Structures are given as structure tokens and as C-alpha cells.
Write a protein that holds these residues in place. Structure first.
Motif, PDB file in Angstrom:
ATOM      1  N   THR A   1      -6.278   9.140   8.036  1.00 58.52           N
ATOM      2  CA  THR A   1      -6.632   8.107   7.073  1.00 58.52           C
ATOM      3  C   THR A   1      -7.966   8.437   6.423  1.00 58.52           C
ATOM      4  OG1 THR A   1      -5.373   6.233   7.943  1.00 58.52           O
ATOM      5  CG2 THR A   1      -7.487   5.755   6.892  1.00 58.52           C
ATOM      6  N   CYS A   2      -7.971   8.493   5.092  1.00 59.05           N
ATOM      7  CA  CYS A   2      -9.190   8.695   4.313  1.00 59.05           C
ATOM      8  C   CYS A   2      -9.785   7.322   4.029  1.00 59.05           C
ATOM      9  CB  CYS A   2      -8.889   9.460   3.030  1.00 59.05           C
ATOM     10  SG  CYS A   2     -10.166   9.357   1.753  1.00 59.05           S
TER      11      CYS A   2
ATOM     12  N   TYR B   1      -5.475  -7.849  -1.502  1.00 64.06           N
ATOM     13  CA  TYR B   1      -6.446  -6.806  -1.811  1.00 64.06           C
ATOM     14  C   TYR B   1      -5.768  -5.616  -2.469  1.00 64.06           C
ATOM     15  CZ  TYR B   1      -9.943  -3.141  -1.164  1.00 64.06           C
ATOM     16  OH  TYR B   1     -10.825  -2.103  -1.359  1.00 64.06           O
TER      17      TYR B   1
ATOM     18  N   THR C   1      -0.033   6.259   3.875  1.00 65.58           N
ATOM     19  CA  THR C   1      -1.474   6.243   4.133  1.00 65.58           C
ATOM     20  C   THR C   1      -1.933   7.435   4.969  1.00 65.58           C
ATOM     21  OG1 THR C   1      -3.343   4.859   4.836  1.00 65.58           O
ATOM     22  CG2 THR C   1      -1.346   4.711   6.184  1.00 65.58           C
TER      23      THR C   1
ATOM     24  N   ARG D   1      -6.473  -4.164  -6.115  1.00 65.44           N
ATOM     25  CA  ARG D   1      -6.883  -2.788  -6.366  1.00 65.44           C
ATOM     26  C   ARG D   1      -6.120  -2.213  -7.547  1.00 65.44           C
ATOM     27  NH1 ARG D   1      -8.295   0.814  -1.067  1.00 65.44           N
ATOM     28  NH2 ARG D   1      -6.067   0.598  -0.593  1.00 65.44           N
TER      29      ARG D   1
ATOM     30  N   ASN E   1     -11.688  -8.292   2.430  1.00 76.04           N
ATOM     31  CA  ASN E   1     -11.072  -7.367   3.373  1.00 76.04           C
ATOM     32  C   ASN E   1     -12.103  -6.788   4.331  1.00 76.04           C
ATOM     33  OD1 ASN E   1      -8.886  -5.976   4.490  1.00 76.04           O
ATOM     34  ND2 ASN E   1      -9.252  -4.171   3.209  1.00 76.04           N
TER      35      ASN E   1
ATOM     36  N   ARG F   1     -13.215   9.518  -2.832  1.00 79.67           N
ATOM     37  CA  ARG F   1     -13.746   8.163  -2.789  1.00 79.67           C
ATOM     38  C   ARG F   1     -15.118   8.076  -3.437  1.00 79.67           C
ATOM     39  NH1 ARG F   1      -9.293   5.419  -1.677  1.00 79.67           N
ATOM     40  NH2 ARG F   1      -8.279   6.078   0.266  1.00 79.67           N
TER      41      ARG F   1
ATOM     42  N   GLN G   1       0.799  -1.217   0.000  1.00 82.15           N
ATOM     43  CA  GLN G   1       0.000   0.000   0.000  1.00 82.15           C
ATOM     44  C   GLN G   1       0.834   1.270   0.000  1.00 82.15           C
ATOM     45  OE1 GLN G   1      -2.945   1.167   3.395  1.00 82.15           O
ATOM     46  NE2 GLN G   1      -4.207   0.270   1.768  1.00 82.15           N
TER      47      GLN G   1
ATOM     48  N   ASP H   1     -11.492   4.654   2.530  1.00 80.68           N
ATOM     49  CA  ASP H   1     -12.193   4.376   1.283  1.00 80.68           C
ATOM     50  C   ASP H   1     -13.465   3.583   1.535  1.00 80.68           C
ATOM     51  OD1 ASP H   1     -12.672   4.328  -1.461  1.00 80.68           O
ATOM     52  OD2 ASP H   1     -11.560   2.454  -1.728  1.00 80.68           O
ATOM     53  N   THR H   2     -13.395   2.576   2.406  1.00 84.35           N
ATOM     54  CA  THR H   2     -14.581   1.776   2.705  1.00 84.35           C
ATOM     55  C   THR H   2     -15.459   2.469   3.744  1.00 84.35           C
ATOM     56  OG1 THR H   2     -13.209   0.503   4.245  1.00 84.35           O
ATOM     57  CG2 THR H   2     -13.546  -0.410   2.044  1.00 84.35           C
TER      58      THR H   2
ATOM     59  N   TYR I   1      -5.262  -8.716   3.235  1.00 86.13           N
ATOM     60  CA  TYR I   1      -4.918  -7.314   3.047  1.00 86.13           C
ATOM     61  C   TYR I   1      -4.026  -7.146   1.826  1.00 86.13           C
ATOM     62  CZ  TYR I   1      -2.601  -2.830   3.883  1.00 86.13           C
ATOM     63  OH  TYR I   1      -2.077  -1.568   3.750  1.00 86.13           O
TER      64      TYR I   1
ATOM     65  N   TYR J   1      -1.478   7.721  -0.792  1.00 83.21           N
ATOM     66  CA  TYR J   1      -0.792   6.452  -0.571  1.00 83.21           C
ATOM     67  C   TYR J   1       0.712   6.647  -0.421  1.00 83.21           C
ATOM     68  CZ  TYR J   1      -4.978   3.695  -1.568  1.00 83.21           C
ATOM     69  OH  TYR J   1      -6.225   3.120  -1.523  1.00 83.21           O
TER      70      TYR J   1
END
Ligand SMILES: CC(C)CCC[C@@H](C)[C@H]1CC[C@H]2[C@@H]3CC=C4C[C@@H](O)CC[C@]4(C)[C@H]3CC[C@]12C
Ligand SMILES: Nc1ncnc2c1ncn2[C@@H]1O[C@H](COP(=O)(O)OP(=O)(O)O)[C@@H](O)[C@H]1O
Lengths: 329, 126, 239, 297, 43
Positions: free
Chosen positions: D162-163, D267, D76, D271, D244, D89, D11, D165-166, D264, D72
Motif C-alpha cells: 500500500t502506497c 472520502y 490497492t 477524491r 478520514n 503522492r 476505491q 497517500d496520507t 471512508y 487503485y
């Protein structure tokens, strides 16, 4: 061959100078950048013909979908949409009065439609027949008398009310593909697919002057505003401006990048600009006095099949095989 | 004025050589595909040979495929058809037909004689 | 400017009605397919048009037919009321779906003229994208001539002597080897012109038929299906 | 008790690099595609409308990418803007699924134009394509609307911004249900549609053999590679998204941490594969077609 | 051909001068040659 040799000698003797050299003193028109003010879309198939009304506002466009669409060029509104019995129509016209519109083509029949009708629609006012070949250019003389150019190597002059071939003009060795009228409407020049354009007297019914010099089929003719000259476009990709007084070729318009024949030509109201639609999907405006390519009118996804300059000189209409008709000003 | 006057012809014994030429004048001639056409006495009008602008891609009617070598001289502004062999069936009137459109690969000449970009023709007999 | 506003409103309403009519006409016009029926004047064209009519009217020379196969309407036109020069009126047929080229394969004397006309149609600037349905006709007459052997194709086409039947040939019932060889030689002579140029823009569909053949409609239907399938594949960028 | 994310390099470095490559390729590709469709294309048809909308969705995805690249590459950590994260997002997703929907529409349209060429000629209009495109965009915006609320921004224990995403850990179950619904409706159903439509297209191109027309092999190859690219890029991504989400809901203990770490890392890789679409779809749908290349000046 | 040959063929210099005079006299009345202002141009 003696007559041809004498005519050639006379033409050479009268060829005392060149139009480009004489007009070199006159300042060139420079660069011309006409833009598309209006885009008249709505034609199903390719547009094979174009003519402006005497009012300089209305337009008629003929399309091989069997459609005669009378547009209002100012507002881009289809005033009329006449369906045609024969789908393949290669000619269209406005009567000088404006009450009639002609069409014709592979049906060999000139159909005259009455626009200004008391019923409230467009109907087949007349169906002139007698031509033995496809019609390529039919235009009205005085709204009751129409000259039609056909593919049977002969032109005709019909009285619409009588519906009979009053006059026949013969002498072309190939199919006539263009027809233009003098501003006095006394003589008309018809060009055949034999690299020959003949000037016919309306009343006499016989050719008065035959002009040669082209290499291939002539596809378009327009008259100079003064009426003493006419420009011809042909399949050899070169336009030729002939002068009636000189009885011989006067100017040649050509280039190296052009390798495609001309389809439709149209002089400017002043005669300084000779417009010519080409098969390379772009129209070209030339300085008729300087023989130089003044500018290019691009914007057609297909070849420019019809080209008409309005009587007021305000705008041009370029109809292409891409079912699109564009207005330039 | 487009002219394609033909030269060469006349009576010839079968199997002889009779080279025909055309004086193509009135056009560039360096871009037009050219053809030789023949009209038999009282029998239609049939295309004989074709040759492109650059002189390559030469083709001939199968009836005279082996013989009748065609050639073109752009600088001399002329085109020739050399008849290596002759037969009584080859006795006909020969015309030179210019392709109508200059820079195209198609020739749309006329069958029942009305074409304009065609010479007067020369009569050959066996 | 109340009068001017009313005039503009009436103009817009008339234009809207005309545009609705034009949309209906566009649906009908795209739904129907134009088929330019070409070929040598000797034989093949008028009989085929009449047979398709028996499965739609010409007055001034153009014999038109508006037959329908399944649910798709076809427009086949035989333009016969024209003097001599196909060059100028051929330009118009650049919007047609296909050119049904009827070739009188039984007459070897005029076969070269048909081949030249096919080459001109194939290499024409405006017919580059228009596919041709080859429709070699009078197969019964060709078979009878070959069996009789009165005239040899080697006299008219010297390359026929060295020609051999392709391994992909599909002989009909009976199909005497001479007849099959002659028919496929003519087909290959036309397909050589077909494949010499085009670079995938259009393809020639070599169907053999006779005057009394009732499968012509299905042949044209399948050829049009393939033509528009390839037109869509080009349009959809699927090569 | 929470996992420490030992394999964070997938990541911190892998995703920024993959997104940078995808930006570099897809920006140029989709800009060229939309420029061709706007200023140098034909009078347009339905398939042109669908392809232009797909190119626009890919281009907007590419334009959304650089914010995520900065996020990123900064370990992060957010690149400032706070609520702008909710925007990013959103836009990202509303383009991603947007392409996943428009790739469906094209795959539907081609099925009409190949399996039934004659029949689907009068029963087809450009206005219908415009209406379907507007409906697809509306469905995308409505279905991805909850992203604007879920995709908040939080502060981690490591003092990082941390933004999400989910979502944050508070709304993890509700967002898991929402993401399962979005995968079923906007990915799984479109995946089934495109798979079936192309399978039928291949069946029509092979078994019918076009009677006599050759050169269908390249069309079959293009269809097959489009199918494989869509599958190998989107199926693992959407599988690993739900995996995830479930791993964040469940596990979160040293006993089952490593497996979570695995789901993780993969994933993250998946992505990147999703981003690769916004480069391969413009290449296959536009740059791999002869008509587009010919119309490319 | 005899009728066409027998004509009052003027020198091409005179024809060119006449055409130039016609173009110059009507030069102002051509919107295409000189672009009229958008207020005057109906399009
Ligand atoms: C040349 C013409 C016909 C192309 C037309 C393209 C149109 C139909 C496409 C291109 C971009 C699309 C828009 C992109 C963004 C939005 C914002 C969203 O909140 C509602 C849908 C909406 C408004 C889309 C509607 C459809 C749309 C406008
Ligand atoms: N399985 C997991 N275990 C622990 N932390 C995770 C896991 N998955 C993601 N995270 C962390 O949660 C944060 C938010 O991740 P997510 O909302 O999935 O999208 P993004 O990683 O793009 O922000 C990220 O910074 C990531 O490091």
C-alpha cells in the motif's frame, strides 16, 4: 483626353510581351523559408516605420508611443531611444552618413535628430515645418537635404541647414503615402492615395512620368536596385512593378487568397525578390521576375506596418502593429 | 486609369424621372461599395446613396429615401440611380464615388471635393 | 578582445539603462488613456477640448489635452490640422482607448454626414475593437430648434414620423416630449449603426451633452471604465 | 479490531474509473491550453501567466494520475517502484494544491481587473505575475515537502503493498496536524480568497451594471459556475480528508466501525471530485472564454 | 500630361530583358535569394 489616349496607345504599343512569359525560361526561386534570427522587442505601441542605416547593421524603428528606437540588429541592443514630442509618428529615416535620423507624422513637422552629437545624447537638430498635412514618408538624400511625402497631396524637398522648403512637388490628387529614392538619388517616385505614382526630378522639381494602373490608395513604394523600375503596393491587395523605360505597368503580383491591402514593400538587393507586408498579419516575398509568391513571412500578431531590406541584403526587418520588430535571414 | 464618367442629366420638370448611370472602368467593380453623392449649387457636398458589392444593403439619404432607387450591374460594369420623383432641391451635380478599400464595409470619401475615385459628375436641374 | 569586451559591456549597460527608461515609460503609457476626439467639422469638437482644458497644448494642428479625472490621466486629441481624407490618418488611432464622437445633433442637414462617418468608424477594419463614446452635443440648440419647429426632422429623416419614444427613455428636467423624442431618435439612429456590427468587440456609449456641460469628464471617465472592464473581461476569458 | 473496509468498491473500481475519465479529458484539455499559451497566444499578460501556470499544474496532476490509476485498479496494491510512491503522492499533491493556489491568483487578478479597471492598469506588470507565480510554486513545494517523508509505503495484513497517500499508522497524529495546517493555509485561505474576490466581481458586474454595456450575464454565469465547481469539488474533498484522518486516529473498533466506513466511502467519492477540477477548470477558464476560442486557431 | 506622354518609351520586352539581366548579374550578391552560410551571416 487626347494626351491620355495617346499615352495609353503608346503604352499598348510598347506592351509587346509579358514579363512572366519572357522570364518563364528563367528557373523560379522555389520555396523561401526565412526564419526569425532576431526579435527586437521593447516598443510600447505599434511600430509605424522602419529604416536601415547605410552600415547595414543599425536600425531605426518609430512607434506611436512617441519612440524612435535605434537598435543594434546584430546584438538586439537598443543603441538609442529618442522620445518624440508628437506621439503619432508614421515615418522614420536614416541619413546616409548615419549622424541624423528623421521622423514625422500627424504633427505635420519633420523632426531631424542628431545622433552623433558631441554632447553625448540625441537632440532635435532641426524641426522642418511648412507641410499642411500628415507626413507619411520622409527620407534623406545626402544627409543635408531631405525629401518628405505628406498628406497634403504634395511632396517637399528641404535643406536641413537652411530649414526652408527649397522645392515643392505637386500634382498628386490624393495624400502621398510612400516615397522611395533611386540609387542615383536623382529622381524619386512618390505614390498618392489616388492609385498614381509620380516620378519627380530632384533638381527640376516637376514630375517626369506619372504611372497609373492601381485601383485604390498606394501605401508603399520601393525602387528596383537597377533604378529603372519600382514596385508599388496598394489597398487593392495587388502589387504592381512599373518600368521607367516602358513608362507603363510591367508586372502585377496578386492572388485569390489575398483580400487585404499592402502596407509596406521592399525589394531585394538583387531585385529578384519583392517583399511586401500585408494587412493579414503576414509578409509575402514574391519572385519579381516570375510574379509567383515565393514565400510567406508569418510570425506577427498584427499587421506588418513596416518592412525594410538592408543595404547588404543579409537581413530583413518586419515591424508590425504588435509592437514587435523581427529580423529575418 | 480609374474613370467614373457619368451619363444622364439635364433639365427636367419637377416630379419627373431622370435615371443617371456611371461608366465605372479601371477596377474590378465587383467588390467595391459604391455611392451616389450630390453637390448643391454653392452648398457643400452631401452623400446620396450607398450600395454594397453584391447589390444588397442599399441605403439612401433620408431626404431622398422614398425615391432615388439605386442599382448595380456587375456584368454590365455599371451603376444606376433612377430618380422616380424630382424636386427643385434635387437640382445639383451628381457624382459616383467608389469606396477606397475594396473588401471593406466602410466608405471614407471626401467632403470638400478632392476625392480621386469619383466621376466628373452630371448636372441635373428642376 | 579586451576592447571588444569593453564595447559589448558598454552596449549592454546602455541597453539596460534604455530598457529601464522604457519600463518607466510603459508604466506611464499604460496608465494614461488615449481618446481620439472625432466628429463633424461643423461644431462640437474644439469647444469640448477647450472646456476640458479649463477643468495640454496644440501647436501644428492637433489640439491635445492631458486632463486627469480622479487619479487616471486621459489624453484627448483633436486632430484638426489635416486636409480632407480621414481614411489614412484614422488608421493610426487603432491603439486608442476610445473615440469620443461629437455629433452636432442640432443640425439635421449634416446629421446624415455624421451618421455616415460613424458607420465608417464603426465598420473600419482597424477600429473594430475601438469603442466609441457618442457625445451628441448642442442639446440646448436642438431643444430650441424643436420647440420653435422651424424645420422638421421628418423632412430629413422620414422614419422619424413613425418613431416613438422608447419605454426605457430617461427624460431630463423639463424634457418636452418633442425634444425628448427627437433626441432619442437621433440616439437610436446612431445606435442602430452601433448594433448592426461589432459582435461584442466594442460598444457605443450614447451620452447627450451641451457646450457648457461640466459633467463631460465624468462621462468619459465612466465610459473608459466600462471599456477597459470589457477589455479585461475579454482578456480574462470571462466572456 | 481494525475495520475490514466492506465498501471497498469506492476505491477498487469507482476511483480508477473517475481517474481514467479525468485523465482522458484533462490531458487533452490542458495540453491544448498549454500549447495555446506557448505557441499560439498573445504577447501575454499577468492573467495569461497565471492561467498558463494553472494549466501546467493541472496537466502535471493529470500526468501523475495514471500511476494512481494502476495502483487503485490493482486492488490497492502498488505498481512497483517503492520510493516512487513518495514521488507520486508528492507530485500529485504539489499539483493539486498548486491549482488550488493558482485558481486563487487568477481570482485575485480578475478582482483587480474588474472591480478597479482603471486603477489596476498602471499598477500591474507581467513581471509581478511571474514573481508571484514563482513564489506560489515555492510555497507549494515547501508546504508539500513533508509529503515526501510521510507518504511512505507499507505492507498490509492481506499481503498487499500500500502506497500510503496520507501516512502510515505510526505518524498518523503528526500527519493529521500537518494536513490540518495544509488545509488551513493552502486550501482554506485560498478558498476564502477566491470566494471573496469572485463575490466582489459579481457585485461589480451586477450592481454597477457596466453603465450601458450589455452581455455581462454570461460573465456572471461563468464566475458563478467557477465558484460552484471549485466549492463542490474541493470543499467536500478537504473536509473528508480530515474526517478520514480523524477516523483512522479514532474509532478503529467494531462499535464505531460503520461510521468510519461511511467516512471512508464518501472520502473516496470526494477524491474523485477533486480530480474533476483538473477537467472543469481548463474548460471554464480557457474553453469557456471567447478570446481563447478565437485565438484557438 | 504632355510632358509625361513625350518620352523615349522602350518596348516592355527590352525592359524585362534588362531587369532579368540585372537580377541574374547580382544574384550571387543577394543573401536573401541564396542563403549564405551561418558563419558568413552575421545574424
Ligand atoms: C513565457 C514565460 C514568461 C513563462 C514563465 C513561466 C515560469 C515563471 C514558471 C513556469 C513553470 C514554473 C516552475 C515549475 C517548477 C518549478 C520547480 C520547483 O521546485 C520550483 C519552482 C519551479 C522552478 C517553477 C518556477 C516558475 C516557473 C518556471
Ligand atoms: N477509514 C479507514 N479505515 C481503514 N482503512 C483505511 C481507511 N482509510 C483508508 N484506508 C486504507 O489505507 C490505505 C491508505 O489510504 P490513504 O493513505 O488514505 O490513501 P490511499 O487510499 O490513496 O492509499 C488505503 O489502501 C485504504 O484502503
Amino acid at each position: 483626353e487626347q494626351l491620355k489616349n495617346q499615352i495609353r496607345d503608346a503604352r499598348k504599343a510598347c506592351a509587346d510581351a509579358t514579363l512572366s512569359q519572357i522570364t518563364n525560361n528563367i528557373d523560379p526561386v522555389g520555396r523561401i523559408q526565412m526564419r526569425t534570427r532576431r526579435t527586437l522587442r521593447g516598443h510600447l505601441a505599434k511600430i509605424y516605420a522602419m529604416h536601415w542605416g547605410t552600415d547595414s547593421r543599425l536600425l531605426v524603428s518609430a512607434s506611436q508611443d512617441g519612440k524612435l528606437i535605434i537598435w543594434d540588429s546584430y546584438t538586439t541592443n537598443k543603441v538609442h531611444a529618442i522620445p518624440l514630442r508628437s506621439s503619432w509618428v508614421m515615418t522614420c529615416a536614416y541619413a546616409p552618413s548615419g549622424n541624423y535620423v528623421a521622423c514625422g507624422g500627424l504633427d505635420n513637422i519633420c523632426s531631424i535628430y542628431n545622433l552623433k552629437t558631441r554632447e553625448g545624447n540625441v537632440r532635435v537638430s532641426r524641426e522642418l515645418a511648412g507641410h499642411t498635412g500628415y507626413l507619411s514618408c520622409c527620407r534623406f538624400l545626402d544627409d543635408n537635404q531631405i525629401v518628405t511625402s505628406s498628406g497634403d497631396t504634395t511632396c517637399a524637398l528641404w535643406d536641413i541647414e537652411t530649414g526652408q522648403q527649397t522645392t515643392t512637388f505637386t500634382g498628386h490628387t490624393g495624400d502621398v503615402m510612400s516615397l522611395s529614392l533611386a540609387p542615383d538619388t536623382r529622381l524619386f517616385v512618390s505614390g498618392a492615395c489616388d492609385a498614381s505614382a509620380k516620378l519627380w526630378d530632384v533638381r527640376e522639381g516637376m514630375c517626369r512620368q506619372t504611372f497609373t494602373g492601381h485601383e485604390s490608395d498606394i501605401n508603399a513604394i520601393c525602387f528596383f536596385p537597377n533604378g529603372n523600375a519600382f514596385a508599388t503596393g496598394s489597398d487593392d491587395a495587388t502589387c504592381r512593378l512599373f518600368d521607367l523605360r516602358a513608362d507603363q505597368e510591367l508586372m502585377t503580383y496578386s492572388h485569390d487568397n489575398i483580400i487585404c491591402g499592402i502596407t509596406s514593400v521592399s525589394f531585394s538587393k538583387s531585385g529578384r525578390l519583392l517583399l511586401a507586408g500585408y494587412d493579414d498579419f503576414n509578409c509575402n516575398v514574391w519572385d519579381a521576375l516570375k510574379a509567383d509568391r515565393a514565400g510567406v513571412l508569418a510570425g506577427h500578431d498584427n499587421r506588418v506596418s513596416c518592412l525594410g531590406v538592408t543595404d547588404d541584403g543579409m537581413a530583413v526587418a518586419t515591424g508590425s502593429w504588435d509592437s514587435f520588430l523581427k529580423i529575418w535571414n | 486609369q480609374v474613370q467614373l464618367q457619368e451619363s444622364g442629366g439635364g433639365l427636367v420638370q419637377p416630379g419627373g424621372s431622370l435615371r443617371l448611370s456611371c461608366a465605372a472602368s479601371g477596377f474590378t467593380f465587383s467588390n467595391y461599395k459604391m455611392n451616389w453623392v450630390r453637390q448643391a449649387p454653392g452648398k457643400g457636398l452631401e452623400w446620396v446613396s450607398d450600395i454594397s458589392q453584391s447589390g444588397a444593403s442599399i441605403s439612401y439619404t433620408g431626404s431622398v429615401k422614398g425615391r432615388f432607387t439605386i442599382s448595380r450591374d456587375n456584368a454590365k460594369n455599371t451603376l444606376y440611380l433612377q430618380m422616380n420623383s424630382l424636386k427643385p432641391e434635387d437640382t445639383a451635380v451628381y457624382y459616383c464615388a467608389r469606396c477606397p478599400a475594396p473588401f471593406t464595409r466602410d466608405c471614407f470619401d471626401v467632403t470638400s471635393t478632392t476625392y480621386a475615385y469619383r466621376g466628373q459628375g452630371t448636372q441635373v436641374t428642376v | 578582445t579586451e576592447d571588444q569586451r569593453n564595447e559589448e559591456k558598454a552596449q549592454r549597460e546602455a541597453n539596460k539603462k534604455i530598457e529601464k527608461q522604457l519600463q518607466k515609460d510603459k508604466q506611464v503609457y499604460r496608465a494614461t488613456h488615449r481618446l481620439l476626439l472625432l466628429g463633424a467639422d461643423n461644431s462640437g469638437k474644439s469647444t469640448i477640448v477647450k472646456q476640458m482644458r479649463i477643468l495640454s497644448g496644440g501647436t501644428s494642428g492637433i489640439f491635445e489635452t492631458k486632463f486627469q479625472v480622479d487619479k487616471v490621466n486621459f489624453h484627448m486629441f483633436d486632430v484638426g490640422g489635416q486636409r480632407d481624407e480621414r481614411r489614412k490618418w484614422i488608421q493610426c488611432f487603432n491603439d486608442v482607448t476610445a473615440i469620443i464622437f461629437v455629433v452636432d445633433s442640432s443640425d439635421y442637414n449634416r446629421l446624415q454626414e455624421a451618421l455616415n462617418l460613424f458607420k465608417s468608424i464603426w465598420n473600419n477594419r482597424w477600429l473594430r475593437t475601438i469603442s466609441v463614446i457618442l457625445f451628441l452635443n448642442k442639446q440646448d440648440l436642438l431643444a430650441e430648434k424643436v420647440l420653435a419647429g422651424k424645420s422638421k426632422i421628418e423632412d430629413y429623416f422620414p422614419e422619424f414620423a413613425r418613431y416613438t419614444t422608447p419605454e426605457d427613455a430617461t427624460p431630463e428636467p423639463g424634457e418636452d416630449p418633442r425634444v425628448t423624442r427627437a433626441k432619442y431618435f437621433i440616439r437610436d439612429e446612431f445606435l442602430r449603426i452601433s448594433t448592426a456590427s461589432g459582435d461584442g468587440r466594442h460598444y457605443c456609449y450614447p451620452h447627450f451633452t451641451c457646450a457648457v456641460d461640466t459633467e463631460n469628464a465624468r462621462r468619459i471617465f465612466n465610459d473608459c471604465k466600462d471599456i477597459i472592464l470589457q477589455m479585461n473581461l475579454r482578456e480574462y476569458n470571462l466572456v | 479490531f481494525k475495520c475490514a473496509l466492506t465498501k471497498t468498491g469506492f476505491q477498487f473500481y469507482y476511483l480508477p474509473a473517475v481517474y481514467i475519465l479525468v485523465f482522458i479529458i484533462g490531458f487533452l484539455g490542458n495540453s491544448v491550453a498549454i500549447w495555446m499559451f506557448v505557441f499560439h497566444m498573445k504577447p501575454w499578460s499577468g492573467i495569461s501567466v497565471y492561467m498558463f501556470n494553472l494549466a501546467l499544474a493541472d496537466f502535471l496532476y493529470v500526468l501523475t494520475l495514471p500511476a494512481l490509476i494502476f495502483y487503485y485498479f490493482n486492488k490497492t496494491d502498488w505498481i512497483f517502484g517503492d520510493a516512487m510512491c513518495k514521488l507520486q503522492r508528492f507530485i500529485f499533491h504539489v499539483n493539486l494544491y498548486g491549482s488550488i493556489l493558482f485558481l486563487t491568483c487568477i481570482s485575485a487578478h480578475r478582482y483587480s481587473g474588474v472591480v478597479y479597471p482603471l486603477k489596476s492598469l498602471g499598477r500591474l506588470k507581467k513581471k509581478n505575475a511571474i514573481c508571484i507565480s514563482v513564489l506560489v510554486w515555492l510555497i507549494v513545494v515547501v508546504a508539500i515537502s513533508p509529503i515526501l517523508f510521510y507518504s511512505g509505503t507499507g505492507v498490509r495484513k492481506n499481503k498487499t503493498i500500500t502506497c500510503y497517500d496520507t501516512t502510515s499508522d505510526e505518524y498518523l497524529r503528526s500527519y493529521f496536524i500537518y494536513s490540518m495546517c495544509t488545509t488551513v493555509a493552502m486550501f482554506c485561505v485560498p478558498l476564502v480568497l477566491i470566494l471573496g474576490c469572485y463575490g466582489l466581481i459579481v457585485r461589480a458586474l451586477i450592481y454597477k451594471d457596466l453603465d450601458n454595456s450589455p452581455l455581462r450575464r454570461k460573465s456572471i454565469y461563468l464566475v458563478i459556475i467557477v465558484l460552484t465547481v471549485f466549492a463542490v469539488s474541493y470543499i467536500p474533498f478537504h473536509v473528508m480528508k480530515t474526517m478520514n484522518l480523524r477516523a483512522r486516529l479514532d474509532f478503529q473498533t467494531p462499535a464505531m466501525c460503520a461510521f468510519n466506513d461511511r467516512v471512508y466511502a464518501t472520502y473516496q467519492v470526494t477524491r474523485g471530485l477533486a480530480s474533476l477540477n483538473s477537467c472543469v477548470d481548463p474548460i471554464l477558464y480557457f474553453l469557456a472564454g471567447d478570446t481563447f476560442r478565437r485565438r484557438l486557431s | 500630361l504632355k510632358m509625361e506622354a513625350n518620352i523615349d518609351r522602350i518596348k516592355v520586352s527590352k525592359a524585362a530583358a534588362d531587369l532579368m539581366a540585372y537580377c541574374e548579374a547580382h544574384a550571387k550578391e543577394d543573401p536573401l535569394l541564396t542563403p549564405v552560410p551561418a558563419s558568413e551571416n552575421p545574424f
